[PDB]
């Protein structure tokens, strides 16, 4: 039946949550709010806008005026890209090359509109993804927790939810996909409690992209 496998990006693709959870604690706390690695980590799968609005009705018990929001996203981006950039998450393309190889369409359905990991896309997977076949920041008006992404990613597939299954690492997009109808397996790559994945609606959990990788061909879809 399986038709697609739909890669959230940050956290499954690129070994990128260190730099993203480290810039948001860090330009958060330049602006004199708080947020831990670890509440940034939380966050994973919101767009950069939806996650400055949500800290400050938290924190301020106000929104965020779309001011702040540009300056602060600007901020984190570019902390984001003063770092090293992000290497691969190990696992990710030993199993797009086994999905590949087995007649399914990778897509990427990602919160991300960063720009330097995007395009960067091709060169760290080559011959796996298509921008036609993905979801970006830059083409949803919700992001995840709400499910807008992976329905959006269904639409551009031509697939029905029963013929997808969606690879996450953060509980927010967990939620999302599982939202959206799919099958959605959780990776926990982070510093999290899987328990937090499964209580978001993952179908499976994996403790990493490699194990998922080496148990692919026993899963049955
Ligand atoms: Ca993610
Ligand atoms: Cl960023």
């Known amino acids: ?36 690695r670890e509440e940034a980590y939380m966050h994973n799968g919101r767009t950069g806008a939806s996650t400055i609005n949500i800290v400050f009705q938290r924190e301020l018990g106000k929104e965020a005026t779309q001011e702040e929001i540009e300056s602060i996203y600007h901020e984190k981006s570019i902390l984001f890209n003063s770092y090293p950039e992000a290497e691969r998450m190990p696992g990710a393309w030993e199993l797009l090359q086994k999905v590949k190889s087995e007649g399914l369409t990778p897509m990427v359905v990602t919160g991300s509109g960063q720009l330097s990991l995007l395009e960067r896309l091709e060169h760290n997977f080559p011959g796996m993804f298509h921008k036609e076949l993905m979801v970006t920041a830059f083409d949803v008006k919700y992001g995840k927790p709400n499910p807008e992404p992976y329905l959006m990613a269904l639409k551009k597939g031509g697939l029905k939810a029963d013929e997808a299954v969606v690879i996450e690492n953060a509980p927010l997009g967990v939620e999302a996909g599982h939202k959206a109808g799919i099958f959605t397996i959780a990776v926990n790559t982070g510093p999290l409690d899987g328990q937090v994945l499964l209580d978001a609606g993952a179908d499976l959990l994996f403790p990493s992209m490699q194990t998922l990788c080496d148990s692919w061909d026993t899963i049955m879809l």
């Open 1 to 36: 039946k399986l038709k697609a496998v739909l890669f959230d990006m940050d956290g499954v693709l690129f070994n990128s949550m260190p730099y993203h959870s480290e810039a948001w604690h860090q330009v958060m706390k330049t602006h004199g709010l708080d947020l831990s």
